[PDB]
């Protein structure tokens, strides 16, 4: 495939340090995986700039599927359009450790990237949903059977996360 640069850390997961839009728009990926919330809000971090980046395009189909049919659940998803970025998005919620939710939902979360063959990914939970970027990294490797190419976009922690793996 057209992925580059990746760094290999098992069978079927590959790291880089990019800004999953920028690598949306280079790839154009069958399916890129949006950080959602259970609104499909696409107001800051992943969802915010992944939105951003389709002139709200993202925002506008999300409202019609829910008022079509209402919140996903946490560790959900639902495939929809993804515009000018990838053929499709897979938006993802992972827990909110800000907000108390459960951080085993996470692997739900992630067994949603079994139902596609390859997919350019954020790390789930991570971010602006508080929790441990380096735990999301495990869950991820020890949950993903499909071929994921994760981007982190913050340098120091892609470095971290390289370091700390074996
Ligand atoms: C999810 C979190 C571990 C990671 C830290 O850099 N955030 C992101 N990773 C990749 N592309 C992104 N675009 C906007 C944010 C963002
Ligand atoms: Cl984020």
Do not use: W
Request: with cysteine.
């Amino acid at each position: 495939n057209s992925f580059s640069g990746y760094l290999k850390l098992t069978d079927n997961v590959y790291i880089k340090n990019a800004d999953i839009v920028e690598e949306a728009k280079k790839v154009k990926p069958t399916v890129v995986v949006n950080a959602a919330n259970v609104y499909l809000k696409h107001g800051g971090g992943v969802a915010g700039a992944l939105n951003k980046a389709t002139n709200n395009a993202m925002q506008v189909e999300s409202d019609d599927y829910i008022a079509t049919n209402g919140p996903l659940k946490v560790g959900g998803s639902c495939v929809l359009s993804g515009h000018n970025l990838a053929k499709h998005c897979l938006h993802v919620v992972g827990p909110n450790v800000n907000k108390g939710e459960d951080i085993q939902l996470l692997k739900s979360a992630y067994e949603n990237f079994n139902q596609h063959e390859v997919l350019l990914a954020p790390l789930l939970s991570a971010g602006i949903f508080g929790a441990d970027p380096i735990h999301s990294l495990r869950v991820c490797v020890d949950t993903v059977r499909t071929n994921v190419y994760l981007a982190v976009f913050d340098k120091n922690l892609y470095d971290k996360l390289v370091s700390s793996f074996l």
